[PDB]
DNA sequence: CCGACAGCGCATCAGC
DNA sequence: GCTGATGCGC
DNA sequence: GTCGG
């Protein structure tokens, strides 16, 4: 954090222009500079030091000089003053509540959680789970609840059906000492890029956390990806523990290389890998790496068997997990 | 200067 | 119903 | 907002 004060001015930028402005390439590029800058290990000194960094410009360097100069930006000093955009900020703090329904709410005179509350009949599904959580969902998960939250995944999973796999992704695999939410990715042996050989891969797994109470809620359900909360078991005489957002995505069997690196993440990672790899003639998704042809449509997927195979196409010497926290 | 910016699953909706 | 665009999320 | 070409 030597450069804290820096990255939080640049992420409350990117968060105005996705939620407010709804500029995804302005968030983007707040996000890429923040997180360049979050990795540099010196405190930074001036906006120019910072514009040697890759995705540090012009303007956001100048911003840097006013912010070492004053502790503050004189343009997010005025954002926080907005009403607007203060309410639509808020609004999208709810899951569910993207940049166009924050808009929409604030339109309504619906601007408040109080308002929120008082208007559930105006949300999906989705928005409603988000509401009720709203508090649980700004918690962080510390580690050792993860690590109960995973006992119970595999362990249920395997009561299912011994021949899946599931692996817990997102920041906890890179090691992280606290995660935002649980990312699990799940395989079984019937479903592989060349055949589904049982229905209701997921749906059996999500079915058995929900019979032991542990998958409380459902933001959203398909073949593939599942998106819920969950929460783990109290003791006698005990609090609660908050609900937590819960992702499962059952990726084809022969696929979990690149799965397991896609869920691993972390997002601005996979965003910087992405990307070198294209300038390297390769597309990376979540199942495969395929190569560009001369007219830019994608190729054939290539061998993969391992994670590091598909740092080896692009030429990037292998990062461990831990190392992929941008 | 200016095209391009990573890639995709599920929910919702308009148009038919 | 389906298809394609959009919103929102990972 | 930034960058490669
Ligand atoms: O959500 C955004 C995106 C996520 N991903 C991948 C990579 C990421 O690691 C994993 C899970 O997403 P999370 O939002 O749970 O992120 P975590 O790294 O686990 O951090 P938390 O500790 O949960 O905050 O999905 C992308 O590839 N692109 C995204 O845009
Ligand atoms: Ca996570
Ligand atoms: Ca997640
Ligand atoms: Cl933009
Ligand atoms: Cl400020
Ligand atoms: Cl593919
Ligand atoms: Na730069
Ligand atoms: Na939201």
Not at 103 to 128: A, M, P, S, Y
Not at 139 to 159: A, T
Request: aromatic share 8%.
């Amino acid at each position: 954090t030597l450069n804290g004060g820096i990255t939080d001015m640049l992420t409350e930028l990117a968060n105005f222009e996705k939620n407010v402005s709804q500029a995804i390439h302005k968030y983007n590029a707040y996000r890429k500079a923040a997180s360049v800058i979050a990795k540099y290990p010196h405190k930074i000194k001036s906006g120019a030091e910072a514009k040697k960094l890759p995705g540090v410009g012009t303007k956001i360097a100048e911003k840097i000089d006013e912010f070492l100069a004053t502790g503050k930006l004189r343009k997010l000093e005025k954002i926080r003053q907005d009403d607007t955009s203060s309410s639509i900020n808020f609004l999208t703090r709810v899951s569910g509540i993207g940049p166009s329904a924050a808009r929409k709410f604030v339109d309504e005179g619906i601007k408040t959680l109080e308002d929120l509350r008082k208007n559930e009949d105006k949300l999906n599904h989705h928005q409603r789970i988000g509401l009720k959580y709203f508090g649980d969902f700004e918690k962080r998960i510390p580690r050792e609840e993860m690590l109960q939250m995973q006992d119970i995944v595999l362990n249920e999973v395997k009561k299912v059906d011994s021949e899946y796999i599931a692996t817990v992704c997102g920041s906890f695999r890179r090691g992280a000492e606290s995660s935002g939410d649980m990312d699990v990715l799940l395989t079984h042996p019937s479903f592989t890029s060349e055949s589904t050989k049982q229905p209701k891969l997921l749906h059996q797994v999500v079915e058995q956390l929900q019979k032991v109470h542990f998958i409380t809620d459902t933001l959203s359900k398909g073949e593939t990806k599942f998106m819920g909360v969950c929460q783990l078991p109290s003791k006698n005489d005990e609090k609660e523990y908050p609900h937590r957002r819960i992702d499962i995505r059952l990726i084809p069997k022969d696929q979990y290389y690149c799965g397991v690196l896609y869920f691993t993440g972390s997002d601005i990672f996979n965003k910087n890998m992405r990307a070198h790899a294209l300038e390297k003639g390769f597309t990376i998704n979540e199942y495969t790496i395929r190569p560009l042809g001369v007219t830019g449509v994608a190729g054939e997927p290539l061998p993969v068997d391992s994670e590091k195979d598909i740092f080896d196409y692009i030429q990037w010497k292998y990062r461990e997990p831990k190392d992929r926290s941008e």
